[PDB]
Design a protein around this ligand. Sequence first.
Ligand SMILES: Cc1c(NC(=O)c2cc3c(s2)CCCC3)cccc1-c1cn(C)c(=O)c(Nc2ccc([C@@H]3C(=O)N(C)CCN3C)cc2)n1
Length: 266
Amino acid sequence: SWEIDPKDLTFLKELGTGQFGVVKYGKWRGQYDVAIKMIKEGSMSEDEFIEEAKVMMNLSHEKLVQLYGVCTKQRPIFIITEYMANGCLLNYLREMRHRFQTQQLLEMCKDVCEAMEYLESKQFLHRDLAARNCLVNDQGVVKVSDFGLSRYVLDDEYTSSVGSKFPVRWSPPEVLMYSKFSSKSDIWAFGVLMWEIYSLGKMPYERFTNSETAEHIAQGLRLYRPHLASEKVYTIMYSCWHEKADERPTFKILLSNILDVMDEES
Ligand SMILES: Cc1c(NC(=O)c2cc3c(s2)CCCC3)cccc1-c1cn(C)c(=O)c(Nc2ccc([C@@H]3C(=O)N(C)CCN3C)cc2)n1
């Protein structure tokens, strides 16, 4: 059930490169748009991923990027997914021509929060939630991408907490200090993602290094209010950054808060 025949794929366009190498746009059976991860040799724990892919095929939500299947008979292996025409959310936010209204920004947060609440309901962590790992479709709907795949990355610079590619600026103190990953580390990251959205893709803690960020957030320093965020919106993102993990909200609570602010500020 999980296995796509790669001969059914027509490759049409380069979409760029990620942690596992090249990603392409194409058609499945000459008709249906797909994206194809071509998994670079040595980049992935492949056997483990493949066993997990069986489970990930059951995860389905309108705001999650849909896994269609995998090609695992030949190397490089392929991950086939839903295609998102407007690319990654970070680059989308950075294009100032969009001149987003604040209601549109809050809708982007809601899109992500819905996906994350779904994943929360299935006891499934993202582990690398950030604007760079969200995608945007042709209707401007934001969807969460590459949830769970951090587990199969073989690159020590990505995996190590002091590595060059580790998401230090999206991580809570307990992740950076003790590697305590939980629903609440995703909550922290989501707060940072809200900040990214309202900051139109600025780097979190843009004047600090990763090392300086780690020490500052351990001392209780936080990100502060983006110009485009109302006090009510800022309260929601800030609530994700409680020092004590158990005092952070759930995604269900965040979703209710976002919906309330939509009713109050629209
Ligand atoms: C998800 C993705 C990545 N990222 C990854 O593969 C990984 C991230 C992580 C991994 S692997 C493991 C650990 C966790 C983090 C890289 C390149 C393209 C796409 C990608 C995928 N899909 C499913 C798309 O629909 C898509 N769309 C897209 C991309 C670019 C453009 C377009 C373009 O063609 N170029 C060349 C530049 C930007 N632009 C907007 C348009 C659509 N991109």
